[PDB]
Short mmCIF file of all heavy atoms in Angstrom, two decimals:
data_model
loop_
_atom_site.label_atom_id
_atom_site.label_comp_id
_atom_site.label_asym_id
_atom_site.label_seq_id
_atom_site.Cartn_x
_atom_site.Cartn_y
_atom_site.Cartn_z
N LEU A 75 0.81 -1.23 -0.01
CA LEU A 75 -0.03 0.00 0.00
C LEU A 75 0.87 1.26 0.02
O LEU A 75 0.39 2.28 -0.44
CB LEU A 75 -0.96 0.02 1.23
CG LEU A 75 -2.01 1.07 1.19
CD1 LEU A 75 -3.31 0.56 1.65
CD2 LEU A 75 -1.65 2.35 1.95
N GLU A 76 2.10 1.14 0.53
CA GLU A 76 2.94 2.35 0.58
C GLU A 76 2.29 3.34 1.50
O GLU A 76 1.72 4.34 1.00
CB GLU A 76 3.27 2.92 -0.78
CG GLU A 76 3.58 1.79 -1.79
CD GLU A 76 4.47 0.74 -1.32
OE1 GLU A 76 5.50 1.08 -0.67
OE2 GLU A 76 4.23 -0.40 -1.66
N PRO A 77 2.31 3.11 2.84
CA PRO A 77 1.25 3.86 3.66
C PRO A 77 1.39 5.29 3.66
O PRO A 77 2.50 5.88 3.66
CB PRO A 77 1.58 3.23 5.02
CG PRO A 77 3.06 3.02 4.98
CD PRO A 77 3.32 2.48 3.60
N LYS A 78 0.22 5.96 3.76
CA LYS A 78 0.09 7.32 4.15
C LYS A 78 -0.49 7.33 5.57
O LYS A 78 -1.23 6.45 5.96
CB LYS A 78 -0.79 8.16 3.24
CG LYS A 78 -0.58 7.93 1.72
CD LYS A 78 0.47 8.83 1.13
CE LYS A 78 -0.06 10.24 0.78
NZ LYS A 78 0.97 11.14 0.29
N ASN A 79 -0.13 8.39 6.39
CA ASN A 79 -0.44 8.43 7.79
C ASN A 79 -1.53 9.51 7.97
O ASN A 79 -1.21 10.67 7.96
CB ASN A 79 0.82 8.75 8.56
CG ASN A 79 0.64 9.01 10.09
OD1 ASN A 79 -0.51 9.13 10.58
ND2 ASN A 79 1.69 9.10 10.78
N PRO A 80 -2.81 9.13 8.25
CA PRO A 80 -3.80 10.16 8.49
C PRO A 80 -3.50 10.83 9.84
O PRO A 80 -2.79 10.26 10.70
CB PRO A 80 -5.11 9.38 8.54
CG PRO A 80 -4.86 8.06 7.91
CD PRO A 80 -3.41 7.77 8.12
N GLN A 81 -4.06 11.96 10.05
CA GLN A 81 -3.59 12.93 11.11
C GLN A 81 -2.11 13.28 10.96
O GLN A 81 -1.36 13.30 11.92
CB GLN A 81 -3.90 12.29 12.53
CG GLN A 81 -5.31 12.08 12.88
CD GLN A 81 -5.75 10.64 12.66
OE1 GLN A 81 -5.06 9.82 12.03
NE2 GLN A 81 -6.93 10.31 13.24
N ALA A 82 -1.76 13.54 9.70
CA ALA A 82 -0.48 14.08 9.36
C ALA A 82 -0.68 15.25 8.46
O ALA A 82 -1.75 15.31 7.79
CB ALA A 82 0.43 13.06 8.74
N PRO A 83 0.27 16.18 8.33
CA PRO A 83 0.12 17.34 7.43
C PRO A 83 0.63 17.03 6.07
O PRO A 83 1.35 16.01 5.87
CB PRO A 83 0.90 18.43 8.17
CG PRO A 83 2.04 17.66 8.79
CD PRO A 83 1.49 16.31 9.15
N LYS A 84 0.33 17.87 5.11
CA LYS A 84 0.75 17.70 3.75
C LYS A 84 2.14 18.27 3.52
O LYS A 84 2.86 17.72 2.68
CB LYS A 84 -0.20 18.34 2.77
CG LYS A 84 0.15 18.31 1.29
CD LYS A 84 0.48 16.94 0.78
CE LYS A 84 0.87 17.00 -0.69
NZ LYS A 84 -0.01 17.73 -1.56
N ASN A 85 2.54 19.34 4.24
CA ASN A 85 3.81 19.95 3.99
C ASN A 85 4.24 20.75 5.21
O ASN A 85 3.39 21.05 6.06
CB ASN A 85 3.80 20.90 2.76
CG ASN A 85 2.62 21.88 2.79
OD1 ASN A 85 2.16 22.20 3.86
ND2 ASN A 85 2.20 22.35 1.62
N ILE A 86 5.52 21.04 5.33
CA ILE A 86 6.14 21.72 6.44
C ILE A 86 6.97 22.82 6.01
O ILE A 86 7.63 22.73 4.97
CB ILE A 86 6.97 20.73 7.31
CG1 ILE A 86 6.14 19.53 7.83
CG2 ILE A 86 7.71 21.49 8.39
CD1 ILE A 86 4.93 19.91 8.67
N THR A 87 6.86 23.96 6.69
CA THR A 87 7.55 25.19 6.33
C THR A 87 8.24 25.78 7.64
O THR A 87 7.85 25.50 8.71
CB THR A 87 6.67 26.25 5.78
OG1 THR A 87 5.80 26.75 6.77
CG2 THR A 87 5.80 25.65 4.69
N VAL A 88 9.24 26.60 7.40
CA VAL A 88 9.92 27.29 8.46
C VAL A 88 10.67 28.48 7.86
O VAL A 88 11.29 28.39 6.81
CB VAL A 88 10.82 26.39 9.26
CG1 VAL A 88 12.00 25.84 8.41
CG2 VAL A 88 11.35 26.97 10.51
N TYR A 89 10.67 29.62 8.58
CA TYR A 89 11.37 30.83 8.15
C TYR A 89 12.85 30.62 8.28
O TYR A 89 13.34 30.13 9.32
CB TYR A 89 10.91 32.01 8.94
CG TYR A 89 11.16 33.33 8.29
CD1 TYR A 89 10.12 34.19 7.96
CD2 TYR A 89 12.43 33.80 8.08
CE1 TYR A 89 10.33 35.42 7.36
CE2 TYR A 89 12.70 35.06 7.52
CZ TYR A 89 11.64 35.80 7.18
OH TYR A 89 11.86 37.04 6.62
N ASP A 90 13.61 31.03 7.34
CA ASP A 90 15.06 31.07 7.36
C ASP A 90 15.47 32.45 7.66
O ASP A 90 15.16 33.37 6.88
CB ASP A 90 15.72 30.56 6.02
CG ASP A 90 15.50 29.12 5.79
OD1 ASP A 90 15.40 28.38 6.82
OD2 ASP A 90 15.45 28.67 4.66
N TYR A 91 16.19 32.68 8.70
CA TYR A 91 16.56 34.03 9.15
C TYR A 91 17.89 34.53 8.58
O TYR A 91 18.26 35.58 8.92
CB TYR A 91 16.57 34.10 10.69
CG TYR A 91 15.19 34.03 11.27
CD1 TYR A 91 14.72 32.95 11.94
CD2 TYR A 91 14.32 35.14 11.20
CE1 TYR A 91 13.40 32.90 12.51
CE2 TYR A 91 13.06 35.18 11.72
CZ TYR A 91 12.64 34.04 12.34
OH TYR A 91 11.35 34.02 12.90
N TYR A 92 18.53 33.75 7.77
CA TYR A 92 19.75 34.20 7.06
C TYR A 92 19.44 34.58 5.67
O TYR A 92 19.66 35.70 5.24
CB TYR A 92 20.81 33.07 7.12
CG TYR A 92 22.23 33.53 6.73
CD1 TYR A 92 22.84 34.67 7.30
CD2 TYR A 92 22.90 32.88 5.77
CE1 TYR A 92 24.10 35.08 6.95
CE2 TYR A 92 24.19 33.22 5.38
CZ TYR A 92 24.74 34.35 5.97
OH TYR A 92 26.00 34.72 5.61
N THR A 93 18.93 33.61 4.83
CA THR A 93 18.29 33.94 3.61
C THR A 93 16.82 34.07 3.91
O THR A 93 16.15 33.19 4.40
CB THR A 93 18.50 32.84 2.49
OG1 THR A 93 17.77 33.20 1.32
CG2 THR A 93 17.99 31.47 2.96
N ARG A 94 16.28 35.27 3.75
CA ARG A 94 15.05 35.68 4.42
C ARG A 94 13.77 34.97 3.89
O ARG A 94 12.74 35.09 4.50
CB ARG A 94 14.85 37.21 4.28
CG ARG A 94 16.01 38.06 4.72
CD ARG A 94 15.89 38.34 6.23
NE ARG A 94 15.12 39.57 6.53
CZ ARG A 94 15.45 40.84 6.19
NH1 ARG A 94 16.63 41.06 5.56
NH2 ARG A 94 14.68 41.83 6.51
N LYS A 95 13.89 34.23 2.81
CA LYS A 95 12.77 33.45 2.28
C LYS A 95 12.21 32.50 3.29
O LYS A 95 12.81 32.23 4.34
CB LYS A 95 13.09 32.73 1.01
CG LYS A 95 13.59 33.64 -0.13
CD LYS A 95 14.05 32.81 -1.32
CE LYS A 95 14.63 33.70 -2.44
NZ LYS A 95 13.60 34.49 -3.04
N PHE A 96 11.05 31.97 3.04
CA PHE A 96 10.67 30.65 3.63
C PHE A 96 11.39 29.53 2.87
O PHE A 96 12.34 29.79 2.07
CB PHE A 96 9.16 30.41 3.47
CG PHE A 96 8.27 31.25 4.38
CD1 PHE A 96 7.58 32.29 3.92
CD2 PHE A 96 8.25 30.91 5.71
CE1 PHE A 96 6.76 32.98 4.75
CE2 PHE A 96 7.41 31.61 6.55
CZ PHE A 96 6.73 32.66 6.10
N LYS A 97 11.10 28.28 3.21
CA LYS A 97 11.29 27.22 2.23
C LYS A 97 10.48 26.07 2.76
O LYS A 97 10.71 25.57 3.86
CB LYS A 97 12.74 26.86 2.01
CG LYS A 97 13.53 26.62 3.31
CD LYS A 97 14.99 26.33 2.92
CE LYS A 97 15.77 25.60 3.98
NZ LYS A 97 17.06 25.14 3.40
N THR A 98 9.57 25.56 1.95
CA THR A 98 8.59 24.57 2.39
C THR A 98 9.24 23.19 2.43
O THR A 98 10.46 23.11 2.25
CB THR A 98 7.36 24.61 1.48
OG1 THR A 98 7.59 24.01 0.25
CG2 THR A 98 6.83 26.02 1.30
N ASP A 99 8.47 22.23 2.60
CA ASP A 99 8.87 20.87 2.53
C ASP A 99 7.68 19.95 2.43
O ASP A 99 6.70 20.05 3.32
CB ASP A 99 9.72 20.43 3.78
CG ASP A 99 10.07 18.98 3.82
OD1 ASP A 99 10.03 18.30 2.70
OD2 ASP A 99 10.42 18.42 4.86
N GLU A 100 7.64 19.08 1.45
CA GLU A 100 6.46 18.28 1.15
C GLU A 100 6.64 16.79 1.44
O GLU A 100 5.68 16.01 1.35
CB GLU A 100 6.02 18.42 -0.35
CG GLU A 100 5.76 19.86 -0.70
CD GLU A 100 4.59 19.96 -1.65
OE1 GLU A 100 4.59 19.19 -2.63
OE2 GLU A 100 3.74 20.84 -1.43
N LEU A 101 7.90 16.41 1.78
CA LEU A 101 8.12 15.08 2.38
C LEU A 101 8.01 15.16 3.87
O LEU A 101 8.76 15.84 4.51
CB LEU A 101 9.51 14.55 1.99
CG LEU A 101 10.14 13.35 2.83
CD1 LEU A 101 9.15 12.18 2.91
CD2 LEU A 101 11.44 12.97 2.25
N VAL A 102 7.01 14.40 4.43
CA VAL A 102 6.62 14.52 5.81
C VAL A 102 6.87 13.17 6.43
O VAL A 102 6.54 12.10 5.83
CB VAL A 102 5.18 14.97 5.98
CG1 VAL A 102 5.00 16.33 5.48
CG2 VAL A 102 4.21 14.00 5.32
N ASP A 103 7.49 13.18 7.65
CA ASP A 103 7.66 11.88 8.42
C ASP A 103 6.29 11.33 8.80
O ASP A 103 5.40 12.07 9.24
CB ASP A 103 8.50 12.13 9.67
CG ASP A 103 9.94 12.52 9.26
OD1 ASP A 103 10.68 11.59 8.86
OD2 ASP A 103 10.28 13.73 9.36
N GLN A 104 6.14 10.03 8.67
CA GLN A 104 4.89 9.33 8.80
C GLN A 104 4.92 8.22 9.75
O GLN A 104 4.42 7.08 9.47
CB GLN A 104 4.44 8.84 7.40
CG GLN A 104 4.11 9.92 6.42
CD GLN A 104 3.24 9.39 5.31
OE1 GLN A 104 3.30 8.26 4.91
NE2 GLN A 104 2.32 10.28 4.79
N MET A 105 5.47 8.46 10.96
CA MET A 105 5.43 7.50 12.02
C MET A 105 4.51 8.03 13.17
O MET A 105 4.84 9.18 13.71
CB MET A 105 6.85 7.27 12.58
CG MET A 105 6.89 6.39 13.84
SD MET A 105 8.52 6.07 14.46
CE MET A 105 8.92 7.65 15.26
N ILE A 106 3.49 7.30 13.44
CA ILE A 106 2.67 7.64 14.58
C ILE A 106 3.56 7.47 15.88
O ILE A 106 4.33 6.43 15.96
CB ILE A 106 1.44 6.79 14.72
CG1 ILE A 106 0.52 7.10 13.47
CG2 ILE A 106 0.66 7.09 16.00
CD1 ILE A 106 -0.61 6.14 13.33
N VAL A 107 3.54 8.44 16.74
CA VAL A 107 4.23 8.30 18.04
C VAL A 107 3.34 8.81 19.11
O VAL A 107 2.65 9.84 18.88
CB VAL A 107 5.61 8.99 18.06
CG1 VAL A 107 5.45 10.55 17.88
CG2 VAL A 107 6.41 8.67 19.29
N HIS A 108 3.36 8.21 20.24
CA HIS A 108 2.63 8.66 21.41
C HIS A 108 3.42 8.19 22.63
O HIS A 108 4.01 7.13 22.67
CB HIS A 108 1.22 8.19 21.41
CG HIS A 108 1.08 6.68 21.59
ND1 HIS A 108 1.26 5.87 20.41
CD2 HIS A 108 0.82 5.93 22.59
CE1 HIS A 108 1.04 4.62 20.85
NE2 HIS A 108 0.83 4.60 22.18
N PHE A 109 3.40 9.00 23.68
CA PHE A 109 4.11 8.75 24.92
C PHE A 109 5.61 8.39 24.68
O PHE A 109 6.03 7.24 24.88
CB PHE A 109 3.48 7.64 25.77
CG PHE A 109 3.71 7.69 27.20
CD1 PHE A 109 2.84 8.32 28.05
CD2 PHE A 109 4.90 7.22 27.74
CE1 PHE A 109 3.12 8.43 29.39
CE2 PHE A 109 5.24 7.36 29.05
CZ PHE A 109 4.29 7.95 29.87
N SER A 110 6.33 9.38 24.16
CA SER A 110 7.74 9.38 24.17
C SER A 110 8.20 9.91 25.58
O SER A 110 7.81 11.02 25.98
CB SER A 110 8.37 10.19 23.07
OG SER A 110 8.13 11.61 23.31
N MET A 111 9.08 9.16 26.24
CA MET A 111 9.54 9.53 27.56
C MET A 111 11.03 9.44 27.64
O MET A 111 11.60 8.37 27.23
CB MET A 111 8.91 8.60 28.63
CG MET A 111 9.24 9.01 30.05
SD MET A 111 8.16 8.21 31.25
CE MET A 111 8.36 6.50 30.82
N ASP A 112 11.68 10.49 28.13
CA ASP A 112 13.15 10.60 28.08
C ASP A 112 13.79 10.13 29.42
O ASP A 112 13.23 10.37 30.51
CB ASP A 112 13.56 12.08 27.85
CG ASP A 112 12.92 13.05 28.82
OD1 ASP A 112 11.99 12.62 29.58
OD2 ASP A 112 13.31 14.23 28.88
N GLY A 113 14.94 9.46 29.33
CA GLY A 113 15.56 8.87 30.46
C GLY A 113 16.79 9.61 31.01
O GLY A 113 17.34 10.50 30.28
N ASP A 114 17.19 9.26 32.22
CA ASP A 114 18.35 9.82 32.88
C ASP A 114 19.15 8.83 33.71
O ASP A 114 19.75 9.19 34.72
CB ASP A 114 17.98 11.02 33.73
CG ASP A 114 16.89 10.67 34.74
OD1 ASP A 114 16.11 9.68 34.53
OD2 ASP A 114 16.89 11.31 35.85
#
């Protein structure tokens, strides 16, 4: 099926503060995660 992950967005963007443009991104990570807990 080559899975797609519902409850995921289509694209991701972030402002670049050196080159003032945006730059989007249409490859989105598609791993459901819940309850990630960090150790010490």
Side-chain angles (χ1 to χ4, degrees):
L75 191 139
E76 318 315 317
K78 317 270 278 175
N79 175 347
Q81 296 99 347
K84 174 56 184 308
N85 51 26
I86 300 302
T87 71
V88 65
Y89 201 116
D90 291 331
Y91 285 108
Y92 194 53
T93 179
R94 305 272 272 294
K95 300 176 183 290
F96 285 108
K97 48 183 203 169
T98 73
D99 173 19
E100 302 218 315
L101 161 53
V102 296
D103 293 283
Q104 292 202 328
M105 173 177 79
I106 297 169
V107 65
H108 65 279
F109 206 97
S110 69
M111 186 167 50
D112 54 349
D114 56 329

